[PDB]
């Protein structure tokens with residue numbers, strides 16, 4: 001959509017050069033072997049590697065020199081939004097399933113409210129491993145009809 | 150029946166002609182809906198059966214492929230309005246009367262067997278028309294008979310792999 | 316009855332009547348009795364298919380290595396050309412497998428529902444437990460005793476593990492399955508997952 | 512003692528331990544894979 005790749009972005013190169021020039025301005029103030037100078041020299045390399053990696057991944061830059069993210073579902077940009085999205089969904093489902101399974105276990109007690117303050121660690125440690133298979137567990141429970149009260 | 154091992158819906162007992170207990174969506178629960186759907190299905194079957202040879206015959210006779218007006222509008226509007234004016238549920242699906250001078254309604258069992266045969270052939274013709282319509286999209290400007298000839302060139306397979314996976 | 320971990324009481328829902336039972340269910344996936352049947356059938360089918368796949372993708376490699384025939388490895392079989400296009404063969408497979416898979420699914424729902432031939436009405440399969448059709452599928456008429464079922468399930472589990480191992484072997488090392496075994500035997504203490 | 516375990520399982524202390532471990536872990540990945548915007552896998 002009028003976007004150019006990072007590796008061929010003159011404004012991207014200008015941003016990198018300007019940041020490096022600004023960083024090197026403070027390097028001249030200290031002795032070359034001093035600890036502040038050693039710490040500063042490690043910052044320039046980090047900037048260089050970051051810019052190289054951004055160029056190497058085929059990110060798209062506009063007229064500003066800043067990368068843009070395409071989330072329409074293009075197969076060449078699945079790492080921007082699609083790939084991290086499924087990971088977040090899996091992790092959030094794990095957390096939710098563990099939290100839901102803990103409450104059901106203690107609901108049958110005489111005083112279920114007491115277990116919400118003093119957490120039963122031996123009981124909680126067993127349920128934690130069970131969240132690994134939460135997609136299959138939820139898929140099977142939905143079909144059987146036990147998901148909704 | 151439609152697919153063995155599946156319980157049939159309560160409103161499809163296998164007594165109706167052409168019935169095979171097919172309703173994965175359950176769109177025929179209301180009796181009035183079932184009567185309207187029966188009539189609509191019959192009309193669709195008859196029209197498709199009347200139409201398909203009129204599409205095929207041109208290409209066979211070499212006159213071309215399938216790809217006044219006021220009189221036509223008046224006649225069709227009058228015919229459909231007059232059909233809609235009928236009130237009996239049974240007479241709408243089968244009008245009888247003088248419309249069958251050949252007297253093929255004399256025998257009851259033969260009548261029912263004819264009804265089943267007509268329903269089956271109507272479903273087949275409807276599927277054939279859907280096939281024609283989808284075929285025209287894949288190969289523009291090519292009639293079904295030419296497609297059959299191209300199949301005769303390579304009688305191996307229904308050439309969907311050339312389309313589904315380009 | 317076998318126990319998968321001494322000192323750990325087996326779950327109550329595993330009564331031991333099923334074949335190949337060892338009380339192994341740390342996650343309690345088969346708590347619901349309905350889920351147990353579907354999981355059993357899935358395990359059986361996966362075991363049989365994995366067994367066939369592992370055998371068919373291990374034996375030709377050995378045959379090529381010894382020198383009887385000359386066949387490429389299992390992963391690169393797709394590059395070879397055949398008498399028909401891959402799409403055509405996929406179309407034959409898609410139409411063909413649909414019938415048998417729907418038949419099996421229908422049997423799983425209602426046992427004994429699809430035991431009768433649909434074209435010729437005089438041929439049918441004898442009654443039996445779901446997942447073991449018997450009949451024509453057992454032409455030699457072997458005894459389907461519990462011991463044979465346990466052997467089948469054990470071989471299926473081993474085949475699943477072997478297939479996963481083969482996939483991981485190819486993904487990391489990039490070599491053949493049987494080539495790795497010969498490499499390991501040359502220097503056992505120097506060629507291991509640790510080095511790679 | 513038993514009271515030591517019971518006080519350690521109360522909601523605030525357990526939550527603080529969990530969040531501290533979480534923050535340490537997150538800092539560990541942020542240090543190991545710095546300046547990350549896309550998945551290169």
Ligand SMILES: CC(/C=C/C=C(C)/C=C/[C@@]12O[C@]1(C)C[C@@H](O)CC2(C)C)=C\C=C\C=C(C)\C=C\C=C(C)\C=C\[C@@]12O[C@]1(C)C[C@@H](O)CC2(C)C
Nearest residue numbers: 340341342344361364365368371372389392475476478479
């Ligand atoms: C079927 C199967 C393999 C199928 C392979 C086929 C067809 C191979 C075919 C090919 O070779 C040919 C034919 C040609 C090759 O050219 C072409 C290909 C295609 C490559 C693998 C299954 C593989 C399946 C595996 C490995 C599953 C492992 C599951 C496990 C362990 C579960 C553990 C648990 O479930 C229990 C155990 C208890 C639960 O409670 C909880 C836990 C503990 C979590």
